[model samples]
Target: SDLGKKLLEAARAGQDDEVRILLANGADVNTADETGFTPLHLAAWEGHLGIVEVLLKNGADVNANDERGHTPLHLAAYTGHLEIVEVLLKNGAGVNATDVIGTAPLHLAAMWGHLEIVEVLLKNGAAVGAQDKFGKTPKDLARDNGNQWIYELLEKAEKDLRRKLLEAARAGHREEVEKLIKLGADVNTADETGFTPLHLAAWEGHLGIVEVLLKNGADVNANDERGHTPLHLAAYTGHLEIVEVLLKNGAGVNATDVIGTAPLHLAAMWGHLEIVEVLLKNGAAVGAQDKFGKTPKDLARDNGNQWIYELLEKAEKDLRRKLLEAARAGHREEVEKLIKLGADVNTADETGFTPLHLAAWEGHLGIVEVLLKNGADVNANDERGHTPLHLAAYTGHLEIVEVLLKNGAGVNATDVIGTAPLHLAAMWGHLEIVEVLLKNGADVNAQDKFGKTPFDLAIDNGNEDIAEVLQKA
Candidate 1:
């Protein structure tokens, strides 16, 4: 106990070597006197930085509180021991630890004109807005103490660190970004235009800070004033790696800006082939048309980046394939949708069969008329006269024949073998079709390759009545 007194006295009087000897000789490093003044508290309050270090290294509690509820850090801040304040904080001193009167270290720093200590406490995560039992903040303490400079610094602490985080992220200051982040800076802190730290980092291509913000819960798709997400900026700025990184973190691949322009559109317009490739691979909608009805592929072509244009051309061609399949399978609504998306109605298959040809051949009268309305050529591949009208008449779709004729399908077309639609109709014994052809100007005297006529075939193949109807011609 006498040795404890000696160590405490030695610590207060700056006897650095004697304090270490007393600790090594079995003096309690945490021994408190009658007033709870441990060696660390005495040494810190006396501005004995060396003795404070020795006491702490010898297992003195850096956060030892006296009967007044003041930790040694508060004493150090009041004593103007900058290194001791820093060292205490380094040794896990609670920077915002409140004393019995609700006075934190920042309050002591400001009220005592310890400006250097104030800055050190702030950097170590002090609470400038900490209020004592009297409801006075550190800024108020500095103002009331006639410390204008320290008052201004404390006043600026409220939003200055948040803004500085944005500046650091924008300028790619990796260490400063992490330091602010560790100080509990809002990772999603936004600027005047709603540009968050992630948005700024992504825009400026600060990949490291961008990753840091994201890992710290930054909103990956946070949008700015123009509805531009971080992904949008990354693409528009042609930061290919950042764009990929944004997408890897689940950035909106098809996210559109305020004008309906997506990231792919920006990438395409800017001729960012690698970004485009990354976008397409990540499910970017290449067919996304903007507010002006211009698609990304269109921008690519117009911007002279045929490479990007080529990448989306496959998508466009795949769209047309769906159109063809839908029309062939009698999906009228699907066909209409693809047609609205710019699929050509007259797009022919390898066998020269357009949607109208397939529809008419399959007896889809609704699809046939829809194709006709959408400008499907009624006589597609009619160079040989194997027309929709001929197929409809032979297939017994009388209404299809009527619709085709109304759409101006050649009524008396002859095929490669010189066979008229009437010959096939009469030969197939479609009596009503034979009569409708007659009414639609089918020539009964029209000849085939062997000079066979519809009237002659009807008479030889079947009913005398159909032969009689054709013979009237």
Candidate 2:
């Protein structure tokens, strides 16, 4: 592809007559490079309207695709060569020939703010809604360019669609909604964030438009990329009337998204006590836990809204006194009540210990028994990975160790600092428990990252009984 040099030589020398002579001598008009660029492609890229004209007249391919599948029109439009585009379009270039990336010439024109080229391409049958590689249409590309006039153009088109939607809402224009549905405006067509027109209408308190979009099959529970549903937005913003409409329409009362947050969570976090109550009355689970494992009550308290905090406290107390009482008392009954009320038996305390760890460390065999019976995690560790076995082995709680072992607690459970429970038991000279753990499956050769094993700990503590146990193993 000396096409760049050949085109450059002819165009730079102003050899229109010689260019015509070369064409007559059978010089390939559309000779292309490895990039699929031809003489016309270069001439168009260089804004040489004359060379473009000469090539087009001599039967040069108008829509020759480059390696990237870009036609000469794409180049001309992207380069702002209005005359060249006009010449190409008049000579039969495909107006909507998308490149390898699905970008039509209009998308290029709109993105570059080449208004004249855009108009020409559109007038020549380019689809405005034609999406490029990102599923972004020419309209969205125009918006990205920040050209206010183009934004106005695209927004006007959108507003007209919204107007028809409004008419559908008021006049029950099922046929208009039906026609638009067939034309590919997704009934759930969302913004970049997944906010559908329904969400916007609801957020803006456009009641009738919300109904129309819903009746046309808008997803009442369609979460954005943030997992916020229309109900979540409505409740967060305190749109009471819209809240009623969505709740009556069967929006998910307790749908947790990727964030594990539900509509009630947003309401409580946003300090919408009234809306919170509305969601609750509609069967929104008040005790629903989010990804952070915080209940709606937790979000309310974190908000520092004293009113909301008091309201949530009342609701939680009324609905879950047993969970509250469990925290208040170190009572086994409290732990049992929370489990019976659907509280996570494996839920960590303030220090990250589960109820089983708490019970084991406190020597409350009844609470440990209750937690184990309810499927509490036997080997569950704290934030530091210190399991109940570690606490029992450290404290020389022999009965607790026996119970935990029966429940399948790991004897070799290691902590963040790489010290296993066996290391702690050996260092403390708990000889009987150390023997029990070693027989079960404590790794005798196990060494922490610091290269210290249970044998190392026993030697450090000068405990002959534990040292003999490790030496035997």
Candidate 3:
């Protein structure tokens, strides 16, 4: 331990002879002191280029750091040691390594007003836009320190570097992208074709690059000229990790491109079962159709992928079934989710009971409001020819009756048994329903197939309250 510490001190004091002797005596070239300052770090910090070279040749870690995460390159840049900086870079230093305060070599050089060191660091791919603990970038540091030349250099480099960043992202060069982004490249810059870093990263199946773009504010839903979002490309290429990343970043699951093709369509078409499942689980529209009127299920079948076809079909059915159950249970949130997933509001079960019919019959006023707002046909009838109003009135749900009436429910519409809403309301002795029906211009004198008006039904059921309201109407 003493030998390692002494070797670090000798390197720091620029004692090249002592450093070489210790290293030759089997002292660890990569050995760090109590503060994590290694021989390579000390040599670079004191501008000992020859010592740095000796340590590097003796297997010193080029990126070795101190307790503050300051690497040898960081100390070199901070002390304005141009020769040591170049030597460290040539020996494979991490050009963009950050310290405990988030200061990279560029920030250190710029803050200390070392023009040549700044240039050398920039030439070696240092990130100009990288901020420190105070959110000050290298350019900000240079300007604050009155280093006008360094600040100007950073400003000019920003524009050119961003352009290179776009190319690097498109080419799937993750390292170049990282360097460019750290140096102040715009993550959202779109190409001539409107493809952003996210789009290209996703298209190339570079999950790591996609993540970087997202962290740097690349819009997940940003569309290219062809209207393709990153999700579309990820799904098209079947990059499951990238697809998940896009979705987590708020990629529109149902976003349609220029051809009206959704990510789900591409996933299904390509037989990406896991991706298809992920999209469906995230509320991708199962019923979304492309410009050719092909749903994901249709595309799956056309692509001759029976498994995918059945998967989509089953998901659609399950979604519709959940929609119906949610409506019946008065779960408005679940109903909204199902609708967002493209479940047909008018979808009926084997009994031909639509969600609206179930909600109305169950007296769920909240569910009724949600369904109607989403385009539920108020006059839609079930298998028994019973409209929502008929069920509402029969169930004695006055609020549900009023909601149905306001939405333009045919007041005198009849059921399979030829019983109208008025007939059911009166026969069930719902006096309030009878009054509401009369106020909404219900045909009081209209006779059903049984040759009975609401008046006749009420009197026959001994419903005095309902009969009184019917008589007044």
Candidate 4:
């Protein structure tokens, strides 16, 4: 109790002379107050280097951690105190001591981008590859900041270490990739993302870095976490040059991702027409089917890519010929005009899709206006419980939305999934549509069957802009 009182006073005052006197008087230097921090740990963290020396000289266990397992060195590293780090290191502080969650001092230093503290820990035999509880290493934290110089310094310090660049690349650090490649880091190393440097660079659309990785013999056809090859990512991201480069390097043009989505399907889904054309030109399998037993044409249809749908449908030859004739000559005008002529507009050819639903899904304002005016029920639930208004608002078609709203379409009308048009729009981050619906007397507090309101849906969908608009609405 006497030692505890003496140490607490010394720590609070940050007085080097008083700390020495306490130490000489047999005060326990490692004694913690009610807060569980020892005098030495507090002094070092507070940058009281001289007090730290006195505490250490009097039998304080420099490696002793608090409740969070923060050794004196960990605190020093967290504070970026160079002199304190030196003192703790000299007093045998653990450079790689782990915290409660397995995050070490090095992890903290990397998380803060503290280059000086990182260097000090590394120089004193820190564990460069010690992963935290989340399996993220100190280097992972460092590269997350996209700082090339910090990665370079770590690479030099841990020359024998492999797999670090793999982590950096998978995390999508293009600048770090450049630095790692320049420092002779293995370009082909794979990470937990199952991605090679090329896959990561390709996914990020880092053209310059992709070229560099390929030049250094990176596997251009490497698959990532979702079983997508570099070509798949390039196509999906619309990286024209990278797609070309992968094709030139003999990458598989028809490589399917996890869900059986080919490069062309991904391109069409993302509306990357040029990339789709490039994949087709490079001899990609145009008729490839995914896990859904549907070809690229089906993907185009499902994603509302009517242009690609037409392209792929035309690729079907006889089918396209028969359908083109029917679609062109059967109706008085477009699909909308026929629907307006009292024809069943919601009829799906074979996929069970109605023309009204498809038009709404595609955000075709003109078609929605025609269908809604012709007694097409805007709130008619599809097989998926999604109404025409739901699709229209989901796609953020402001004009079509107004037409539907004015036509007595229920804005709060929910689908089988309990999703209302407002919820769908908010979830998909349709800020304009959410604003319009709210202004038209849409209920913001109306929760879906899942108990999530439009505001909650926007929050769940990670759309900050939509969330802000929904909150204000």
Candidate 5:
């Protein structure tokens, strides 16, 4: 006991060598004094990284909560020692580890305006939204201390981190998704609708995000409150790549939701022919029915996709395969031949891009012209509600834009996010195409999901030429 007390006093005095010698002489590294402060706790509170390391190396509990359940990490964080906090965390100190009164290390760090320590805590998976006993979060403590800078930092970081996790997953921000994953965001965390990150990524057709989430222990066939799995969402949204990923991860092919609707049912209902084919090939029962008692074949027929109906009935082979190949490769002659051979020219692939949409998106002027002449619906929007004209304008194909406009494309057509062709042209600095769109009466003040108009986009993009034209329009 005397040796332990001596070690504690040496640590409290920052006596690194004396603490090491005491530990070598069989003094308990976890010795605590009257107030339950261990030598490690005193060393940490005194900003003694060397003594802390020696104590940890000698088998001190990195997370040893004192009488009040405050670990050495809590003390180190409260004292504002950046290196000591890092060392504690590196030795497996609980960043979100709470003590008595529900006070966490983050609460202490934020209370003292320890900016670097707060960042360290957050980086180590500190819950910014953690509330102590009084219902005060870390940000609340920062605000109470009048540390506006730390308060804002904690506030924005919490909001931005959550947004990066859910919104970025849905919007296909792969880098943000990866960052959040490394920061230990729960990959399977769900929203109010019981839609997990996988569900959001699958619904929005973000294949990269789906892959990352699956790799990080996300439940492949995990059901939501509605009992819909990621497979069902992917199938309904026509995300072929995401569907394949879910299936490959061993998702139940015939898994039914609360409504008794399976992935195959959705794929058929949406006319996602490729997804249907993949589902069927994966052993989905053709006679499988939903709660409505409608089979996949019945849904296909009911949706008026005679081709998909026939395909499901084994009435025909895969004809759209060749059609998509021809369309994607810009083979106009081959596309015409496929059409004559029974390929529906308007047939959309899994992501809902029609032959015309693909050709326009790829800037295949020849194929665009042929498809238009053959009655391609220029105003038909894809899964994202992007019309062929929207693709043409975004890709900056002057001739395709002209052909689309001449063929009666909606000059001010907006996509799912309300982004019009004029907005795309302005954002991409397509000055000539902007002029043409304006001439066709494209609205100059149309705003997208984030509420930015064409003129706003032009100025944000620093395209003075485009800005000047949009200003006059």
Candidate 6:
């Protein structure tokens, strides 16, 4: 055992070559003194990385405990030997090996405010959550040490390398994203070249990350380098339910890119049929044109996609038809809804009758105002060249007549047979309508196809005061 004493002495004194030579001569690599100081223990405590290396090479137990129940790792940690601690753990030191009083490497390093040692312990998988014999965690240790500030530095660094924020989102792991967000990492953290974490999560089709990022206040409508919103990537990537969750969280369906490309075009261009349907239902601009003038329909058509193309075509035709019915029935709610679905405000039936034509004909001022304000063509004429103004005038709707011309209606606009609203109001015995028409500058002397002036029609139809007013005008 003289060699054992000599080897421990040489190791503790940083005599790298002498320790190697002793091990080569068959000195017990685990040789210990009366207090259980093995060559590994002495070398690690002495910060002799090379001696620790050679002793462990000669099969020194990485976990060899000494007289007081301390391993070389504990001594190295207690002494702030970061280099020795990492080397030991790298070569099979028990990460959570508890020494006397059940103190782990995390406990000792944290207990002494040895920041590097604690981080190395953490890096080596030392359990921060584990309790010592006194049932205290590393947090408890940092607390009692009055180095509670150390815990912030430690915990922050833990998440900083634990793939904390954006990388964790890009890595597509749910819990890592969850932990980082719960730890107050920014949900809107962006990368160098492109979008935020939500964009990456959406683009990568990581549904878990998408949900986590979005729930934590990630920008749902955030754009990337291409001016693409997070919805654009998710839609372009065919992430079906990601689209739903994004929309449910108030994502802008009409959100566009630099090319004026919306999510609808992205989904349509990529043949994402279900994605296309979700966008349309969520008020994505169905008729929105890209910079190159490609609507979603044009995208699906040029891409030779029959299902999405037909799906879009069906929505187009169906919404317009629904608008027409809603107008005819005076259903204000359904009318505005269809308009929001990108229904053509100028939508017309086979007879060239637009919603405005129907709304005015039905005397539905409710439908009329909505359609007019929402971009209906005020001068839209039906198959017989009958303007909406003509219907309002003949139907005795004085308010409709006033509102029509107030919205820039063609008061002198005629049917195919040269029957202006004045002629219709005259023959229909609407003295008040005739009065409003004349007030808005109706052509009282304007003639019909049969050379019939409105005054002549008024007299022929036996309208007494209307004829008097019409002729006076």
Question: Please, what is the TM-score per model?
Answer: 0.53, 0.36, 0.76, 0.35, 0.45, 0.66
In order, what lDDT does every prediction score? 0.82, 0.75, 0.85, 0.71, 0.82, 0.82
User: Model 1: how large is the Cα RMSD against the reference?
Assistant: 11.0
| 220-298 per-residue lDDT for model 1 (tens digits) | 9888888889998899999988987888899989888889999889899999989988887786665678999999988
lDDT of 6 by residue, 32-69 (tens): 78998888888888788888888777778999888888
- Tell me how many clashing residue pairs each candidate has: 0, 0, 2, 1, 0, 0
Off by over 4 Å in 5: 34-36, 166-199, 204-232, 237-266, 270-299, 302-473
Give lDDT tens digits, candidate 4, residues 150-201: 7777766566434656656656676776766654476777766677767777
Better of 1 and 4 by lDDT: 1
lDDT of 2 by residue, 314-431 (tens): 6655544444345435676556655643465656656776656767776766666777886878778777878888888888878778888997888667888888888888888789
lDDT head-to-head 4 vs 6, winner: 6
Model 4 segments more than 4 A misplaced = 155-160, 163-473
C-alpha lDDT (0 to 100) for residue 450 of candidate 5: 91
- Per-residue alpha-carbon lDDT of model 3 for 218-292, expressed as tens digits? 888988888889999999999998888888889899999888999999999999999999998888899888899
State the weakest 10-residue window (summed lDDT) of model 3.
464-473
Please give the ranking of all candidate structures by TM-score, highest first, separated by commas.
3, 6, 1, 5, 2, 4
Off by over 4 Å in 1: 1-24, 27-54, 57-120, 123-155, 319-473
In terms of lDDT, the best-performing candidate is 3
Between candidates 2 and 3, which one is better according to lDDT?
A: 3
Q: List pairs with backbone clashes in candidate 1.
A: none
Q: Which residue pairs of candidate 3 clash?
A: 127-183, 128-183
Candidate 5 local lDDT, residue 135: 94
The worst-scoring run of ten residues by lDDT in candidate 1 lies at 335-344
